[model samples]
Target: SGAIYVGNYRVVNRHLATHNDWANLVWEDSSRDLLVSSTTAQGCDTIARCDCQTGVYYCSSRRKHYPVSFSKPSLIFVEASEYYPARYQSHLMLAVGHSEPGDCGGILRCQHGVVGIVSTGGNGLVGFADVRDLLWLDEE
Candidate 1:
């Protein structure tokens, strides 16, 4: 049950959003396609892709857990990030959704893509961009 879940039963998806809300919207798994959220994806509540009667469920977890919904018919959401990995490593995903909902919220990285172990939360499972000209990783 820990792998690819949409409900609160999952660890990352159950974690609080910046505003403390769950299942902001329940997307029917028509094809039984499941999306997963994790600390890598802003503490869970994230769905990478979806294919349903509606279409593919695309959303980023950068800003809390909001989607890029413009109410447009058949729209595809694409997030642009400085830490764009070959396949979007859950750890360095920057969101371009409707809100900055994570604890820190919003895009954060080192200046000019510098690499350094930036201390974050007591758990040390996160990083920060707390340096000059940095994007403000906002690690809590």
Candidate 2:
């Protein structure tokens, strides 16, 4: 049976808070059959539809959907082998696990004491030697 997963985050301004440390983390969600909804860490807020017929979920956001495979998929699964831990100012590498029963796939490198965030589709979120870099300032 298909199931729904929901999560929420609440915080205040002008203060520092501690959240869970998901650094160099990998997860699997093949148990669930669909991505009901998710507010991404940031940007592109409306998901129209999703299909996993190709053995992968194809999803879209916004009314003017260009339909890129990387920008979709509400949930992801990742795997990694660590050379070092980021919290210890150590360099590390992560693997993006995808494919038909994939053993392990893709890579994310965090070097020189920089933390890296990698997508399940292998897109770089931030702080990684590869993929996109971000400057998140929570000022309101």
Candidate 3:
């Protein structure tokens, strides 16, 4: 469920990613300010900008902060989940740590910014779409 709310609209289009199941950038009705606006999910509205410069991020569904162990151009890695083991990796998507199933579309934030949005996760690994890709959807 990559649906998310921006202002008064609900964005349900998850096919915005050109490479993989990574992006969901669609506008509902006449609203199209997702790039400059914040998002809301799980009863929490994004009150800060998404930033990857910080080493840690906040999970909206879990209501906890996790430190970033590693990061690349398109991936952010954290501590591996003890219960779930790694299964696969790819160019467009990869299974890293763990997150809740319903966390899809939930905002991934640092102390003062956001990093990405949850795409899917299970078996001790979670996958999220990079914010850069999400922003690019609006340009297209």
Candidate 4:
């Protein structure tokens, strides 16, 4: 099963990249003043999930999943899940933009299902740089 949701004044921009069976699923919510915002996911049958308030992210599968922690996040990634070692497939999509209520400002992006950062802009990608190191919790 799959689901999608968006908040009020949400200006979402997305890029779809196809991989064998899994690739990065990225989207940008331009409902703020952030310079650039984006998302990236790649897990066979796995979806990414976020708390937004807590800045927590993890792969959610139908039956099983794993959670990952992050530092301080200006923006949060989408919620998703994961399940099995199905096959060999994965893709990636990045986002960048700002438009909405709070007039938020910042650059947000993610790599794989773990490393996420609020950094500079980017190359041919969108306009988000690669920088991770600020706020996050460690699970022991």
> Which model scores highest in TM-score?
3
Q: Which 10 residues in a row give candidate 4 its minimum summed lDDT?
A: 8-17
Candidate 1: stretches off by over 4 Å: 1-8, 11-77, 82-98, 101-140
134: Cα error in model 4, Å: 20
**After superposition, candidate 2 runs with Cα above 4 Å error:** 1-44, 52-79, 83-118, 121-140
Residue range 1-140, candidate 2, lDDT tens digits:
11111132111110111133122112212222111222235432121122211112211211121111232222233344132222211121223233221111112222221112222222422111111111221111
lDDT of 3 by residue, 1-140 (tens): 34333343333324222222223323321111122222343322333334343344345667765665424324233333432233222211333555774555555555644445555465665555444334433322
Instruction: List candidate 3 stretches off by more than 4 Å.
Output: 1-61, 73-96, 134-140
TM-score of each: 0.17, 0.17, 0.41, 0.19
For every candidate structure, what is the RMSD over all alpha carbons to the true structure, in angstroms?
17.5, 16.3, 9.6, 17.2
Worst 10 residues of 1 by lDDT: 50-59
What lDDT is obtained when candidate 4 is compared to the true structure? 0.23
- Candidate numbers sorted by TM-score from highest down: 3, 4, 1, 2
Clashing pairs in 2: none
* Alpha-carbon shift of residue 46 in model 1 (angstroms): 16
lDDT (CA) per prediction: 0.23, 0.20, 0.40, 0.23
Per-residue lDDT, model 1, residue 28, is: 19
lDDT of 1 by residue, 1-140 (tens): 11222224222222222222233322211111112222324333233222111111121333232222122112122233222212212222222233222432222222232221111122212322112211222222
- Model 4 residue runs over 4 Å out of place are 1-4, 7-13, 17-56, 60-63, 74-140
